[PDB]
Amino acid sequence: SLLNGVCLIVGNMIGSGIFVSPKGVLIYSASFGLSLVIWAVGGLFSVFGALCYAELGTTIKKSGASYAYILEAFGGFLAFIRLWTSLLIIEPTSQAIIAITFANYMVQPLFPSCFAPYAASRLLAAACICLLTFINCAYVKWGTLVQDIFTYAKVLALIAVIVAGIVRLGQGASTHFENSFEGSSFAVGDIALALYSALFSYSGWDTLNYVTEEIKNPERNLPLSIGISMPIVTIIYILTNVAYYTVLDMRDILASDAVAVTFADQIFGIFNWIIPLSVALSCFGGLNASIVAASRLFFVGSREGHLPDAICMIHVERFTPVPSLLFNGIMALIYLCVEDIFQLINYYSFSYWFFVGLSIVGQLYLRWKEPDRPRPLKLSVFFPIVFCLCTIFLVAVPLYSDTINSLIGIAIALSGLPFYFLIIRVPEHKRPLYLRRIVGSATRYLQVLCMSVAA
C-alpha cells in the first residue's frame, strides 16, 4: 500500500545530478555553511512545488504536465512556446549534461590530480549518446531490465559513499571540521546560481509523480506521503554533501572534476573497482530513461497540429518512434560539445523555472477565475502563492547577474514565434502551400527513409 508507494515516489525524485551539483554550489558560495543552507532551501522549495503539481495532476488532470496544464489554462500560443523552448533547449542541454558527466567519470580515474584533455571527454560523451539512441531505436525490453539493475548500481554507490564518509568521522577524527563561516553572501548574485545548481539535483519531482499518483491512491495520504517522502530526499543529499566536506578539502573540489573518485582516492586502496564504473552505469540508465520523455511530448504535441504530422511516426514494424529519437539525439548531441556544464546548467535551469512559474500562475488564475470546477483536491491558496513568489525570485535575481544568458534564452524563445505565426493559422496557399506540398514529398521522402508510418 502507501508504505510501498513512498519509495515509488523516491523512485522518481533524483537522478545523476547528485554526482555533479555537489561542486556547483561551492563555485557560488565558498561557504560550506551557505552551501548546506542552499541544499535545505532547495528541499523545502521542492516540497512546495511537488504539492502544487500533485494538486494539479489530479485536479486539472491534464495529460501534459506543465504542458497541457498551460494549454487548458489559456489555450494560446503560450503552450506552443512552451513546447518550443522545451524542445530546442531543455532536454537537449539536460542530456548533453548527463553524458558529459559520464564521460568525465570514465576519464578521471586516470590522470589523477592532473586535468585531462578536453577532446577526449567530449568524444567519449558523443560515442555514448550516439550509441544509446540507436539502441533505444530497438525494443525497450532491453532498456527495461538493464535499468532495473542500474537503479541497484546507483543505490549501492550511494550507500558505499555514505557509510565510508560517516565511519571516517565515527571511528576517528570525530567533529573533524565544525567550521564553515565563509561568506560571499550578498542576498543577490551568485546566490541565485547556487540555487540553480542545487535545485537542479532536486529537479525531477515535477511530472514523474503525476504518472505515479495512481499507484495506490490512498485517500488523502498521497500528499502526506509526499511530505513523508521529500524530506528524506533532502536529508540524504545533505548527508552526502557533509561526507564530501568532512573528507575532502575545498581546493581539491575546486580543482577536481569527478568529485567522487577524488573522494575515493583520499580514503581507500582500491579507488577504482567501485566509484567510476558504478556512476558510469547510473548516469547511463538515467540518460536512457530521460530519453523516452522526448517521444512522449512529441506525440502529445503532435496530437494538435503542432509538430507537423510527418514527425511522430511509429516504425512500420518496430512500432518504434524512430524519427523523434533521431531528431532529439542530434539536437542534444551538439550540446555535449561545450566549454562547461555549469554554463549549460544556468541556461537550462533559467528557462525551466520560467516554465514553472507559468504553470503556477496559470494554476492560480484557473483557481480564481473559472472556480467551482470539480477538483478532487483542495489546498490552502497561500502556499502556492508563496511558491510562485519564490519562483519569481529565482527568475528575477539572475538578471543582474548574467543579463546575457537570460537575454539569449529569451532570444531563442522569441525566435520561436515567427514560425508560429507562419504556421499557426496556416492559409494552405501560395508559397506556404507550395512548400507544404514539398513537405509532403519531403515527408514521403523521409517516409521511405524512416521505414515508419503514423499511428
CATH of the domain at 383: 1.20.1740.10
Instruction: Report how far residue 90's alpha carbon sits from residue 92's, in angstroms, rounded to the nearest whole number.
Output: 6
Please report, for residues 21, 23, 198, 258, the alpha-carbon distance to residue 17 in angstroms, rounded to integers and kept in the order given. Answer: 6, 11, 9, 12
CB count in 10 Å sphere of residue 128: 20
- Which of 243, 242, 263 is CA-nearest to residue 33? 242
- 284 sits in which H/E element: helix 275-302
Helix axes 221-245, 2-10, angle to 10 degrees: 40
Domain range for residue 120? 2-453
Resolution to 1 decimal place, in Å: 3.7
Let me know if 423 is exposed, middle or buried by CB neighbors in 10 A (0-12, 13-18, 19+): middle
CA 347 → CA 4, 240, 369, distances in Å? Answer: 37, 26, 33
Distance of CA 404 to the CA centre of its chain: 22
The CA-CA-CA angle for residues 152, 248, 344, to 5°, reads 65
For cell 489554462, what's the residue? 73
**Of 259, 285, 12, 258, nearest to 128 (Cα)?**
285
78's grid cell: 503560450
Instruction: State how far the Cα of 125 lies from the Cα of 120, in Å rounded to an integer.
Output: 9
Q: What span, in angstroms and rounded, lies between the C-alpha atoms of 190 and 400?
A: 10
Phi-psi region of 218 (alpha: psi -120 to 50; beta: other; left: phi over 0): beta
Amino acid code (one letter) for 217: N
The DSSP letter of residue 453 is E
DSSP β-bridge partners for residue 452: 315
Beta-carbon count within 10 A of 272 CB: 13
**How many domains, in total, are found in the chain?**
1
Beta bridge partners of 314: 453
How far is it, in rounded angstroms, from Cα 146 to Cα 231? 29
The grid coordinates listed for 413 are 524563445
* Look-up of cell digits 531543455: 90
Q: Which residue pairs, CB below 8 angstroms and at least 24 apart, start in 406-414?
A: 406/350, 409/85, 409/89, 409/347, 409/350, 409/351, 412/85, 412/88, 412/89, 413/81, 413/84, 413/85, 413/351
Residues in CB range of 223: below 8 A, 6 or more apart: 51, 54
Say if strands 314-315 and 452-453 run parallel, antiparallel, or are unpaired.
Answer: antiparallel
Residue 87 is given by DSSP the state I
Contact, 431 vs 422, CB < 8 A? no
Q: C-alpha distances in angstroms, 170 versus 154, 164, 192, 244?
A: 24, 10, 35, 15
Q: Return d(Cα 128, Cα 133) in angstroms, integer.
A: 9
Q: Are 314 and 453 in contact (CB under 8 A)?
A: yes
Residue 35 CB-density burial (10 A; 0-12 exposed, 13-18 middle, 19+ buried)? buried
Dihedral of the CA atoms 153, 159, 161, 163 (nearest 10)?
Answer: -150
Residue 442's Cβ-count burial label (10 Å; 0-12, 13-18, 19+) is: middle
Residue from 237, 214, 230, 232 nearest 51 by CA: 230
* Dist CA 322 CA 90 (whole Å): 20
